[PDB]
Structures are given as C-alpha cells and as structure tokens.
Amino acid sequence: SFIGSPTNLIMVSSIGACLFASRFGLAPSVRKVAQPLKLSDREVLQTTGDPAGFTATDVLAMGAAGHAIGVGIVLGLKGIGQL
C-alpha cells in the first residue's frame, strides 16, 4: 500500500468509484432502498453536511464494499500475474 503502488491505485480508484456510485443514486445506499432495479428514494436519519444521504453508515458500508471489492481485484490480478 505504498503511495504509487498499483495496489494502492486499485484501492483508491475502487473507493472513489464506490463513493461516486453512492453519491448520485446509482447504489443501494441508506437513501436508496433496492428492488431488483433499486428505486423509490427514501430518507432516514440525516446526512450531516453534504447533501443527499451520506450518513455515518452510508460511507461506512460503501467504504467496506469498496475495500472488499479491492481485495478481490488485487488478489485476482496477483493470482493471474498482473500488477
């Protein structure tokens, strides 16, 4: 996880893609309950600052999912011999 490593780049890009995905619809966040196609835009608790629904549990889950996706990508690329 040295600054400049391909694993660091993969981790940061995954985290940023997950925050982008949860910022404007586009992900089953605390604001967006999920149907088979993830609709209906509900509201609970409060966002505490920036708009939409980035609560304390929204960034906690998306960071967890973004981290967990990154272990799959890095170790998958490491197993096949990439980066």
Partner 1 sequence: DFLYVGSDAAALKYLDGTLPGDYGFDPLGLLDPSVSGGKGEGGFVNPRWLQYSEVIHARWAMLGAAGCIAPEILGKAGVIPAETAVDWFRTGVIPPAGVYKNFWADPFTLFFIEVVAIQFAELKRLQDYKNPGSQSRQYFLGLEGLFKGSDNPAYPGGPFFNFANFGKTEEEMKKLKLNEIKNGRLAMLAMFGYGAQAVITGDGPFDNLLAHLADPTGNNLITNLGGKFG
Interface residues with partner 1 (CB under 8 A)? 1, 44-46, 48, 56
How far apart are CB 68 and partner 1 at their closest, in Å?
19
Shortest distance, position 74 Cβ to partner 1, whole Å: 17
Q: Which is nearer to partner 1, 40 or 46 (CB)?
A: 46
Residue 63, CA atoms < 13 Å, CB-side half-sphere: 7
Chain breaks in the chain (C to N over 2.5 A) after: none
Q: Indicate the residue among 23 and 38 with the shorter CB distance to ligand CLA.
A: 23
Number of H helices, E strands in the chain: 2, 0
C-alpha–C-alpha distance, residues 52 and 1, integer Å: 31
CB-wise, 41 or 82, nearer to ligand CLA?
82
